[PDB]
Design a protein around this ligand. Structure first.
Ligand SMILES: Nc1ncnc2c1ncn2[C@H]1C[C@H](O)[C@@H](COP(=O)(O)OP(=O)(O)OP(=O)(O)O)O1
Ligand SMILES: [Ca+2]
Ligand SMILES: [Ca+2]
Ligand SMILES: [Ca+2]
Ligand SMILES: [Ca+2]
Ligand SMILES: [Ca+2]
Length: 901
DNA sequence: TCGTATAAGCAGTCCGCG
DNA sequence: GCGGACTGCTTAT
């Protein structure tokens, strides 16, 4: 096999590299790598190295890496550009793996671990590590085993061995219900004392050294705790054995308000799963506890125990150890579904970076562009300092708040990357500028043609047409990857809808799910067999289809995120290719493209409707248009349609055969107007929306910019078995809205769009009547809590104190003195409830850590004093009033003359 | 919340508004 | 009461 790196580090003048050799074995080596950097040289000096602008460069080979670094410093002192890749390990990788990397994940040791630490005095601080580590479960991907290190004797209690038999048993048998599929994979090791546990762990670690290290909060908790605990007991040298090169750094992570410390382990790639999830999941969650995320992702129940976690080991060590094991398994189960590790390896090897750098699109793109340019003997520019400057972004149309019955939406495929490719926007493709007219002059095609030579953006920039820039070239490669995976995702989704339809008529037989590839549209033969399957087989097939779709989504959406991140990076001062001329060239072209096509679509439809000056485009945001289709439906007449699916087909056909060709012609004209390199504005139909045929449903509504709801029948070619709501911006979509309130608001919207005013009125009346019975957590608001200390004046709210922060201070007074009560962590999320007048807490609200039950000594009081009236008005009634007034209907039945009877 | 971008919504505090 | 200035938070793209 072809070799591939596992990890790479610079330590002084040495590169330390772990890698897989040509025989598939893991090796480590130290290489005294001699980097090269570049300086501009005279024309007369014959060379093969040129900067991105075509100026000649001489290569400077250094005796070692420190010499290269010192040289850069001296070039700054002289005031001359020092060109080349200044991150020497990236240059090393580029030299050592000069080809597209093929990797074999089965040879990469992925370690998933979790530790337990009993603490009788609050949260066990990793930087102090003053409490014994009493459990470690460490899953190894190569062995496919869970290694369990269990402390039987502690100053906090001596316990019996954990029992695998009891662990396997049902909760109803008094067991822990450790999944049977992992029971045979557990290797249990009990220890008489902590010193031996930790020494054995380190010896084990040496034998099975993680390449990728992950788990839940491992970077912020498990790793620093293990490091500092070993350090305290044995000393520094022993703790450094967690690094295969025996090198570690305390690394300070700074944000806006305060900073935290982590331990960098040289030669390990730490991908904390909480961070993987936050970057790649595209969720915003009320809580990020593993229990909360596992429930969300996997639909598994809460890991239940009685009493505090600080007493769980002594009261029920059996359960304590089982839950540690299950906690490790939960992360593996999340990864089996979401496939974020697979994603990270894919992108990391593609860019030729340390795998952990996938968290940084700037580093990712710096490496991609460097490797690309190097292939042509081109030399990258030096990074420069820039002040942070604001710059303009997208255009958003102000909608008229209203109901909108029939709607067709269109938007650009990969808008910003497509603009980059069309205009040829790149550091080295800048050809000059032209004299800019007001944007509206280009939108209405009255401005002078910008250039007859170069490709233009309406911000004034001109670009070469003779060759693609490196940014267009490299963005296209990742875009094509994105396109392939989205194809699989959409196929799996359409396949899912086939199975849902068949589930209306399941067969009465015992059979098996079909062995199929869900990434491809089911053949007629598969469809026929599906129609003869049992519900059990169909449901299992549905689950598999949905898992395929999830895998597709992960692969496609994060590749989309990467390419959109390159457009974004052009406007970040730390990017090597930061340039507000290019950043604004993209965003300004985008504004033009939207409003240009708005005009063209309005013109086209007014033509087929024989009208003048009527606005068919009701809304647009960045790269999208929403077209009122009422007149299209009304030209055929609702009575001519057999059912809902019939008019959906008709609008589908109209969008595809009439609108899209008109859109394409309009953009082709715009391309010529701007003299662009290549027409790549592809605005395909997204949604076909409307009420069910013959219902009183309103179809859709807008309340304002970025706030709307649509009843969708077909989304990007997926024809649903059941209509699906597309809701954007409204409170149903906000993590801050109470869970039960999101649910009720969604049902109000569903009723509005599908059934109409009366149905909405019936539901509202019932919700108002019953809601006080809802669990307090389900009706708590959620907020991130920043700057708790800033607004804390003697335990009371300072001036301008935010409502949620007030809630926290209330909580802090009510739990004061308790070392055992959960503390609210700065920067994390809290549940927030309002409090009735004259409550014992002495303020109008209370907040506590999100994803948790509020501590028992104030729970009963919080429940007694909960202000349901304020809660209902603020979270439910206010938003609903917004929805209904926009839609021009009433959530409460108005009096009429009929009441006289 | 270490980690690409801008536009823009709503909640809440403070305080004016005769 | 509402709205503007402002802070805080959270979305859509
Ligand atoms: N997270 C982001 N960071 C930077 N720019 C973004 C982000 N999200 C959206 N944009 C910008 C770039 C996008 O091309 C443009 C339109 O967004 P959107 O329609 O969601 O995706 P897209 O047009 O890139 O892909 P798709 O093909 O899925 O529509 O808005
Ligand atoms: Ca735990
Ligand atoms: Ca788009
Ligand atoms: Ca599309
Ligand atoms: Ca059937
Ligand atoms: Ca869009």
């Amino acid at each position: 096999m072809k070799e591939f790196y596992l990890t790479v580090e610079q330590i002084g003048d040495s590169i330390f590299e772990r890698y897989i050799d040509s025989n598939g074995r893991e090796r480590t080596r130290e290489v005294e790598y001699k980097p090269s950097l570049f300086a501009h040289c005279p024309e007369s000096q014959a060379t093969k190295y040129f900067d991105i602008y075509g100026k000649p460069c001489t290569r400077k080979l250094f005796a070692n890496m420190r010499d290269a670094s010192q040289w850069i410093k001296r070039m700054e002192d002289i005031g001359l550009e020092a060109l080349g890749m200044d991150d020497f390990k990236l240059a090393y990788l580029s030299d050592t793996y000069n080809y597209e990397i093929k990797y074999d994940h089965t040879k990469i040791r992925v370690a998933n671990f979790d530790i337990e630490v009993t603490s009788p005095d609050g949260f066990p601080e990793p930087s102090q590590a003053k409490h014994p580590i009493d459990a470690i479960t460490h899953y190894d991907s190569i062995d496919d085993r869970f290694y369990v290190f269990d402390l039987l004797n502690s100053p906090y209690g001596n316990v019996e061995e954990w029992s695998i038999e009891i662990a396997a048993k049902l909760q109803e048998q008094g067991g822990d219900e450790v999944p049977s599929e992992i029971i045979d994979k557990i290797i249990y090791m009990p220890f008489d004392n902590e010193k031996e546990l930790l020494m054995e762990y380190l010896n084990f670690w040496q034998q099975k050294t993680p390449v990728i290290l992950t788990g839940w909060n491992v970077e912020s908790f498990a790793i620093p705790y293990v490091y500092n605990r070993i350090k305290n007991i044995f000393g520094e040298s022993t703790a450094k054995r967690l690094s295969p090169h025996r090198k570690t750094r305390v690394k300070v992570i700074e944000n806006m308000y305060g900073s935290r410390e982590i331990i960098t382990l040289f030669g390990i790639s730490v991908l904390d799963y909480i961070d993987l999830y936050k970057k790649f999941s595209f969720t915003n969650q009320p809580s990020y506890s593993l229990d909360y995320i596992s429930e969300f992702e996997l639909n598994v129940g809460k890991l239940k125990y009685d009493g505090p976690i600080s007493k769980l080991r002594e009261s029920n060590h059996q359960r304590y150890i089982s839950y540690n094991i299950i906690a490790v398994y939960r992360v593996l189960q999340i990864d089996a579904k979401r496939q974020f590790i697979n994603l990270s390896l894919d992108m990391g090897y593609y860019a030729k970076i340390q795998i952990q750098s996938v968290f940084s699109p700037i580093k990712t793109w710096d490496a991609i562009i460097f490797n690309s340019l190097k292939e042509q003997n081109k030399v990258i520019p030096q990074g420069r300092s820039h002040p942070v400057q604001p710059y303009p972004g997208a255009f958003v149309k102000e909608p008229i708040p209203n109901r909108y019955k029939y709607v067709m939406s269109f938007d650009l495929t990969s808008a910003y990357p497509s603009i980059i490719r069309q205009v040829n926007i790149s550091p080295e493709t800048i050809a000059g500028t032209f004299k800019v007219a007001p944007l509206h002059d280009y939108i209405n095609a009255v401005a002078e043609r910008p250039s007859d030579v170069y490709s233009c953006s309406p911000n004034g920039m001109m670009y070469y047409k003779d060759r693609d820039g490196v940014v267009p070239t490299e963005i296209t490669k990742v875009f094509n990857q994105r396109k392939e995976h989205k194809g699989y995702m959409l196929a799996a989704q359409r396949n899912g809808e086939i199975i849902k339809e068949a589930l209306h008529n399941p067969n009465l037989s015992v059979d098996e799910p079909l062995d199929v590839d869900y990434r491809f549209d089911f053949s007629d033969e598969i469809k026929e067999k599906i129609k003869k399957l049992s519900a059990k087989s169909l449901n299992e097939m549905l689950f598999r289809a949905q898992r395929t779709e999830v895998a597709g989504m992960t692969a496609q959406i994060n590749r989309k995120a990467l390419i959109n991140g390159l457009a974004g990076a052009l406007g970040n001062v730390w990017f090597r290719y930061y340039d507000l001329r290019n950043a604004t060239a993209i965003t300004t072209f985008g504004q033009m493209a939207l409003q240009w096509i708005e005009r063209k679509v309005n013109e086209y439809l007014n033509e087929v409707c024989g009208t003048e000056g009527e606005a068919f485009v009701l809304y647009g945001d960045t790269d999208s248009i929403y077209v009122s289709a009422d007149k299209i439906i009304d030209k055929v007449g609702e009575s001519k349609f057999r059912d809902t699916n019939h008019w959906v087909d008709f609008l589908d056909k109209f969008a595809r055969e009439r609108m899209e060709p008109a859109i394409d012609r309009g953009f082709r004209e715009m391309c010529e107007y701007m003299n662009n390199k290549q027409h790549l504005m592809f605005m395909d139909r997204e949604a076909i929306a409307g009420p069910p045929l013959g219902s009183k449903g309103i179809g859709g509504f807008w309340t304002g910019k970025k706030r709307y709801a649509l009843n969708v029948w077909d989304m990007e070619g997926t024809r649903y078995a059941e209509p699906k709501l597309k809701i954007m911006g409204l409170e149903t979509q906000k993590s801050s809205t109470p869970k039960a309130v999101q649910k009720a608001l969604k049902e109000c919207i569903r009723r509005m769009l599908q059934e109409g005013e009366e149905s909405l009125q019936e539901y509202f009346k019932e919700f108002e009547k019953e809601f006080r019975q809802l669990n307090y957590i389900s009706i708590a608001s959620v907020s991130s809590a920043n700057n708790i200390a800033k607004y804390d004046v003697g335990g009371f709210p300072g001036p301008k104190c935010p409502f949620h922060i007030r809630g926290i201070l209330t909580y802090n007074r009510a739990i004061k003195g308790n070392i055992d009560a959960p503390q609210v962590v700065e920067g994390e999320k809290v549940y927030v409830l309002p409090l009735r007048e004259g409550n014992p807490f002495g303020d109008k609200c209370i907040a506590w850590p999100s994803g948790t039950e509020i501590t028992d000594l104030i729970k009963d009081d919080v429940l007694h004093w909960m202000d349901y009236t304020v809660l209902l008005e603020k979270t439910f009634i206010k938003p609903l009033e917004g929805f209904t007034s926009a839609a021009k209907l009433d959530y409460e039945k108005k009096a009429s003359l009929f009441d006289m009877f």
